[PDB]
């Protein structure tokens, strides 16, 4: 009964995504029912022009990136489409075809920004959240995609700069790539790829001793641990590991983080020889 009117309200909204006159309302009304309705992602993909419309919404704000003129209305509007794209990227029925069209390649311009304005931070996080959604599926295709697209160089920039939240989510994305064996082998293949990552991680340690973050310290340690699992990487880390990880610098902060204490403990034991 009432559900049939609700289903038709969504059906019309999806149809209303096409025309630019009716997109804004349908972008709003559908970004609210994203978790409410299950089959939104297959319907969004297989309907006409709908995925193209969201891609337009993304490119339409590219002029506001450089020079940075991103308004709050622009940011909320384009993120509501990013929310719908996350629904497509989450649903298993559409995830692979979503990656097949290389759709996340168009959020990478947002990860290059540095503006720190609330409209840019909302864009930065919502774009990071889409990637964090893909890495949580732990699918082989996800790891194989992100490595080839050079998202790792994009993260490392956000891990050095940016907010603490942005730093955490970026490290989590890097972390999840390292957790996969293929992600590790890729990063430890060349020296330019290792050293760029390790120096990032070292500069983050010094920043954490002056600007502490509990969750950041946790995922930074986990990244160092995963690198220690690689033979040539473990060697380079015995001379490279920040001394602040070895000493008493982070002792007070980690006094109540059991999981992080154990990871750090294993890390020093892993490099032991």
């Amino acid at each position: 009964g009432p559900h049939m009117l609700e289903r038709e309200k969504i059906y019309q909204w999806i149809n209303e995504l096409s025309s630019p006159e009716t997109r804004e309302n349908a972008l709003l009304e559908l970004s609210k029912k994203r978790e409410s309705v299950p089959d939104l992602a297959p319907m969004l993909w297989h309907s006409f022009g709908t995925i193209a419309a969201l891609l337009q919404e993304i490119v339409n704000i590219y002029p506001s990136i450089n020079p940075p003129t991103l308004t709050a209305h622009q940011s909320n509007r384009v993120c509501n489409a990013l929310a719908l794209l996350q629904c497509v990227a989450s649903h298993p029925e559409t995830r692979s075809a979503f990656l097949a069209a290389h759709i996340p390649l168009f959020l990478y311009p947002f990860l290059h920004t540095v503006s720190k304005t609330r409209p840019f931070e909302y864009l930065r996080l919502t774009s990071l959240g889409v990637i964090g959604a893909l890495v949580k599926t732990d699918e082989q295709e996800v790891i194989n995609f992100l490595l080839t697209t050079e998202i790792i160089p994009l993260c490392l920039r956000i891990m050095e700069s940016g907010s603490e939240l942005s730093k955490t989510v970026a490290t989590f994305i890097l972390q999840k790539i390292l957790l996969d064996d293929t992600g590790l082998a890729y990063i430890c293949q060349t020296y330019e790829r290792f050293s760029h990552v390790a120096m990032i991680l070292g500069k983050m340690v010094l920043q954490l001793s002056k600007e502490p973050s509990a969750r950041l310290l946790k995922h930074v340690v986990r990244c160092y641990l995963r690198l220690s699992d690689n033979p040539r990487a473990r060697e380079a880390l015995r001379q490279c590991l920040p001394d602040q990880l070895k000493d008493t610098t982070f002792a007070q902060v980690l006094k109540d983080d059991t999981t992080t204490k154990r990871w750090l403990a294993q890390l020093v034991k892993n490099l032991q020889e």
């Binding site: 709050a72 940011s75 909320n76 993120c79 609330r118 409209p119 931070e121 909302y122 996080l125 919502t126 990071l128 959240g129 964090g132 959604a133 949580k136 939240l165 955490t168 989510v169 989590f172 969750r215 995922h219």
Partner: peptide, 17 residues
């Protein structure tokens, strides 16, 4: 933007853990 910014922050907090 405020509401959406906040709820997005809570969401990212769960995700990384």
């Amino acid at each position: 933007l405020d509401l959406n910014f906040k709820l997005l922050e809570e969401h990212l907090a769960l995700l990384v853990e």
